[PDB]
Design an enzyme around this catalytic site. Sequence first.
Site, PDB file in Angstrom:
ATOM      1  N   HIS A  14       0.857  -1.204   0.000  1.00  0.00           N
ATOM      2  CA  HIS A  14       0.000   0.000   0.000  1.00  0.00           C
ATOM      3  C   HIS A  14       0.888   1.247   0.000  1.00  0.00           C
ATOM      4  O   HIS A  14       0.613   2.191  -0.717  1.00  0.00           O
ATOM      5  CB  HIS A  14      -0.971   0.047   1.173  1.00  0.00           C
ATOM      6  CG  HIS A  14      -1.804  -1.185   1.327  1.00  0.00           C
ATOM      7  ND1 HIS A  14      -2.394  -1.541   2.518  1.00  0.00           N
ATOM      8  CD2 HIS A  14      -2.135  -2.148   0.434  1.00  0.00           C
ATOM      9  CE1 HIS A  14      -3.058  -2.671   2.353  1.00  0.00           C
ATOM     10  NE2 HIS A  14      -2.884  -3.083   1.105  1.00  0.00           N
ATOM     11  N   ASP A 111      -6.582   3.846   1.580  1.00  0.00           N
ATOM     12  CA  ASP A 111      -6.467   2.742   0.645  1.00  0.00           C
ATOM     13  C   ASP A 111      -7.612   1.739   0.934  1.00  0.00           C
ATOM     14  O   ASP A 111      -8.559   2.057   1.633  1.00  0.00           O
ATOM     15  CB  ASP A 111      -5.062   2.116   0.613  1.00  0.00           C
ATOM     16  CG  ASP A 111      -4.639   1.576   1.961  1.00  0.00           C
ATOM     17  OD1 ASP A 111      -5.488   0.946   2.650  1.00  0.00           O
ATOM     18  OD2 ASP A 111      -3.458   1.769   2.284  1.00  0.00           O
TER      19      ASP A 111
END
Length: 465
Positions: A14, A111
Amino acid sequence: TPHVAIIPSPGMGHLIPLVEFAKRLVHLHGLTVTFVIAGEGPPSAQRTVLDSLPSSISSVFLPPVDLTDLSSSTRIESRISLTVTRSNPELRKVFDSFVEGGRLPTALVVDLFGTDAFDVAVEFHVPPYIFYPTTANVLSFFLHLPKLDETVSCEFRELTEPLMLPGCVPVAGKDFLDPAQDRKDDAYKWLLHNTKRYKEAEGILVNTFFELEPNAIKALQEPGLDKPPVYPVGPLVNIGKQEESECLKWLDNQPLGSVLYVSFGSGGTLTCEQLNELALGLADSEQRFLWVIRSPSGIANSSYFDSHSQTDPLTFLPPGFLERTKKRGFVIPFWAPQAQVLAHPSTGGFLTHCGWNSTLESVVSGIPLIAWPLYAEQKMNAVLLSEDIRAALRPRAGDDGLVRREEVARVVKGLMEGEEGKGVRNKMKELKEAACRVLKDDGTSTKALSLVALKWKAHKKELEQ
Ligand SMILES: O=c1ccn([C@@H]2O[C@H](COP(=O)(O)OP(=O)(O)O)[C@@H](O)[C@H]2O)c(=O)[nH]1
């Protein structure tokens, strides 16, 4: 200028694309960015990634969240989701300081597991956005999951027909991402919960591009019930032009296109038995290889949160393996300069866990794949890559799930030198071209990101006036 706050959920897969995304926002769109980093302890790999950024990018590290109540059996998606959720009080404090500094964010970007931070965004009247670091196919799955959950009452492995969302490769129930595989587990509950929050996002930016997933992107962009705008902005990757040293020096000494890179992401490992067969089959293949190795585990994502390796992975290799492969193989423990490796002229193939950053990096350098999925949504990606995109070959696993040395050698040779690898090598050549096309000033991915940045500049303009 708009200030954008980025709140990643834990994971190198991420943080890395979010950093690439932030660099594009500052360099190409003139924005400012603050990372707000939630976690359990100081950054690891993480600091290398957060280091050397333009000063238009700052980082705030929150106090570590208390996850000491969680059972050691907690699935990663629970931990990842709860790290962001339980951080909300500390995130509120950071937003207060932004307000005091006259820099209230124009957008909060989370995210795929970080949607509870939307609470703080809504409280401060800041538009929430999602940066989605994996495929348009899996995004379609996430957006559909509230409906799938409502309409399907068995564990997904019991479905007899594959799921075939508009524009998506069909996927069997048993191949849905790991946290979907046990609907009683908190991992599913957190997956579900996140997906239910996707309709709250003002936009979803997805790290993929038109030519890579044309059908899934077209479908995602079609108007739909409660469906946010979807912007393909990829491939946002480290192109491998930054200045570990020893493995690249080794690579410099190998023929053009000759080396199979082997890596299972930032968090993957194989069982003992599978590690053994892979080692033996890599040796058997007689191909050159550069393998980033981790100590084996019965849990495929056991290294997800690890800053280092407590045991020496090399002690797990079979007798004579390191001897036989001394010249043609380079085995590096735990972490390699992957962006550099994939961009290196001597690299010719990639045996990958099908993590999406690794996939995109490989696409950008035209490196064909062997698809070896381990956890998370990797099996979905492997089906997409091998059956639809057709840029990966797949090894055959036996009925016990083991890919034996003979199959390892066969698929490695097929990729590196054989007829079966020519199709995928040609496809990757085409995708490499396309990856350049889409990021040009008037390329589709650039257009999409520009539309978002423009929206943010307009919002800031209206607020301050
Ligand atoms: O030894 C390694 C392994 C991984 N990576 C980087 O870490 C990321 C891994 O993300 P991916 O989506 O492929 O898989 P994940 O780690 O999330 O499972 C990619 O950017 C890789 O280039 C790296 O630099 N060195």
